[PDB]
Subunit: 103 residues, 5 copies
């Protein structure tokens, strides 16, 4: 089991770490059919999504996807500093696999 976000992300092909050290600049969420997703941006221009749940996901991931959207919303509203995001770079916008927060 990895002990940090960087090591976790390195377990996956098609992932990279973005180091933001910044609060989330905007938060977007959609309930439209086939676009049940969230999109966040940062002041530097980065745009990331939480993917629409789908065939690329195993059943163990469905609760986690819902948790990640909960996390991003509350981070946005508390202005919480996002340290790193582990993201899939084989999707546009890049898709969030993991997030770390620190003061």
């Amino acid at each position: 089991t990895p002990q940090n976000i960087t090591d976790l992300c390195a377990e996956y092909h098609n992932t990279q770490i973005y180091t933001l050290n910044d609060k989330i600049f905007s938060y977007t969420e959609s309930l439209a059919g086939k676009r049940e997703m969230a999109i966040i941006t940062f002041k530097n221009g980065a745009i990331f999504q939480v993917e629409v749940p789908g065939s690329q996901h195993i059943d163990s991931q469905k609760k986690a996807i819902e948790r990640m959207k909960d996390t991003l919303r509350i981070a946005y509203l508390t202005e919480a500093k996002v340290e790193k995001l582990c993201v899939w770079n084989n999707k546009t916008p890049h898709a969030i696999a993991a997030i770390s927060m620190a003061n």
Copy 2:
């Protein structure tokens, strides 16, 4: 996959973007049978609903509807600025499909 609320909105027939750049003025919620819904308003007079779940909604939208009501409630209680809403303008009040929050 779209990169913002505007492009997302444009993927659907009968939707429109409203730009509010304002906090939610009022939040209303009902548990009454056949009226399990939320209604928000803005200072400018805009009134928007999250629809009662029914046959216009595919199963994947169900969770997303419940999430949208959570988001609108907490956005209200935190006085969070709403940037844009993507809505179905074929319903009265207009029905929320997506929301973006930013300053």
Copy 3:
């Protein structure tokens, strides 16, 4: 579809409106068997319940009943001003059907 709490409330028999314009004074909840409910009070002495879920409630209402109790708890904790309640007056205490909040 109604556009406000008053018009919603009018769609049902045995309901009335209270206009509190005040924060919730007290919040109570219970997990005891057959009494899985919440009760709220206002400074003016009004007492209201979210009913125990039951045969009088259609399946679509079950999720809404849970949400209502979530809303009341967070409204209480943030000292959010309640504008109006729509309640059923054929129950004792009067039972909440819908709520509106505005600053």
Copy 4:
């Protein structure tokens, strides 16, 4: 249907009301197998549990037990004054049936 915690409590055998009028001093929760429970303490040394779900609870209590643990966590974190707890006194620690908050 009762109108307050004291009357609700009096509808059950092996219950009593504690009147704390204080915030929760400590919050403990466990995910360990067979001890999926929460424990609260008050500064006066009183200790209470939310029981591990079990055959002593009817299905309708299952959601309400989960709500109670949510309520105690957020009360702890917001330093909300707990007015009274109704508890079953044939358990050790005494088991929470209901809570009121006021202040």
Copy 5:
């Protein structure tokens, strides 16, 4: 039934109490397949996980595992003092069984 975290922890093999008396330094959450987990850190260098759910967990633990991740997130965002953690020390990072907060 135990009355505190130290006694609860002692009912299990391969556990120990860590006494932190400090807020969470970092919170990390992942939705990546087979790594649906959370990791927290403390200023002192301690790293702990909430395990990916697996065959080492019974059905009654599933909801509590989701609850714990909810608790850690909100503890982190509130800068809540964590008193103790009961952890499995035959996992790396050590795996959270129970948490107590007090300040």
